[PDB]
Amino acid sequence: PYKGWKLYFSEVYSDSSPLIEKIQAFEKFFTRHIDLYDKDEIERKGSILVDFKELTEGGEVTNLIPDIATELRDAPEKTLACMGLAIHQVLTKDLERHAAELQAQTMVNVPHIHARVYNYEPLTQLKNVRANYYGKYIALRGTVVRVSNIKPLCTKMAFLCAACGEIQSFPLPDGKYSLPTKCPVPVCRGRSFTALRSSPLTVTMDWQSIKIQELMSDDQREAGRIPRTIECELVHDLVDSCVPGDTVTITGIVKVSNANDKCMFLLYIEANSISNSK
Numbered sequence: 001p002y003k004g005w006k007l008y009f010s011e012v013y014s015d016s017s018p019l020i021e022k023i024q025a026f027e028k029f030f031t032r033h034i035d036l037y038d039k040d041e042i043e044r045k046g047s048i049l050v051d052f053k054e055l056t057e058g059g060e061v062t063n064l065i066p067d068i069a070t071e072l073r074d075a076p077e078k079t080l081a082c083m084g085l086a087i088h089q090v091l092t093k094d095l096e097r098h099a100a101e102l103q104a105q106t107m108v109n110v111p112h113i114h115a116r117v118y119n120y121e122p123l124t125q126l127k128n129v130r131a132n133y134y135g136k137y138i139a140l141r142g143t144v145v146r147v148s149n150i151k152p153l154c155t156k157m158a159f160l161c162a163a164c165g166e167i168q169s170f171p172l173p174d175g176k177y178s179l180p181t182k183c184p185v186p187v188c189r190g191r192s193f194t195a196l197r198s199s200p201l202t203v204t205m206d207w208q209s210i211k212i213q214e215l216m217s218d219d220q221r222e223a224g225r226i227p228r229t230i231e232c233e234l235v236h237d238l239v240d241s242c243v244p245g246d247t248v249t250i251t252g253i254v255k256v257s258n259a260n261d262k263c264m265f266l267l268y269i270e271a272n273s274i275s276n277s278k
């Protein structure tokens with residue numbers, strides 16, 4: 001009933017899991033506001049931009065998401081996955097109905113849709129970003145200083161279990177090729193999988209790394225303070241959205257980087273959205 005379930009979740013689909021409640025919550029939101037977005041631009045770019053003020057809007061459309069501000073902040077990777085599958089389920093239902101009338105007068109293949117929330121608040125200044133912010137969703141605003149070149153990045157790798165024939169979409173931590181340890185089905189644990197590099201469950205998107213420097217008051221906050229910087233990882237439609245010197249607003253997830261000048265603990269922002277003025 002959920003085509004594209006493995007495009008967002010590595011778990012096995014079960015109607016008893018708490019994910020169903022969250023997914024259907026955004027599904028009600030996206031069905032009522034489907035005319036507010038361009039369904040053609042969503043499918044082409046593979047993403048959707050949602051205003052955070054629309055989600056925190058009081059009323060009837062946001063009836064099933066009263067705690068979106070806390071869940072997105074403390075569990076962004078789980079909230080965006082449900083929000084992404086929801087819009088994918090809304091689009092796959094709106095297109096299967098369109099293809100139903102064409103047949104009378106049904107394989108609709110909707111690709112992965114990145115759920116991208118912008119205009120998130122409160123804004124977090126870079127100096128107050130501590131190590132405790134790991135896994136949290138925040139919004140930054142700084143100057144672009146460096147923009148690396150675009151490179152491919154294998155985010156997920158499909159694996160076929162030789163026991164039951166199930167194909168899982170296994171994420172790679174840092175693009176490092178790794179193998180699953182157990183089959184996600186609750187019956188068998190084959191522990192032996194074959195890589196399906198040509199499978200659609202194997203994700204490969206354009207990757208770009210940019211560096212952001214905080215907005216420093218050149219005289220007020222210059223009383224012995226150095227401008228802090230942080231790396232931001234753009235992907236897919238966010239790639240090539242800013243040049244060095246631009247002032248951008250970035251939302252995303254704080255994560256730990258894994259790659260005298262060598263410090264062994266660096267935080268970066270997995271960019272979920274970027275807004276460039278110029």
Ligand SMILES: [Zn+2]
Nearest residue numbers: 161163164183
């Ligand atoms: Zn299996």
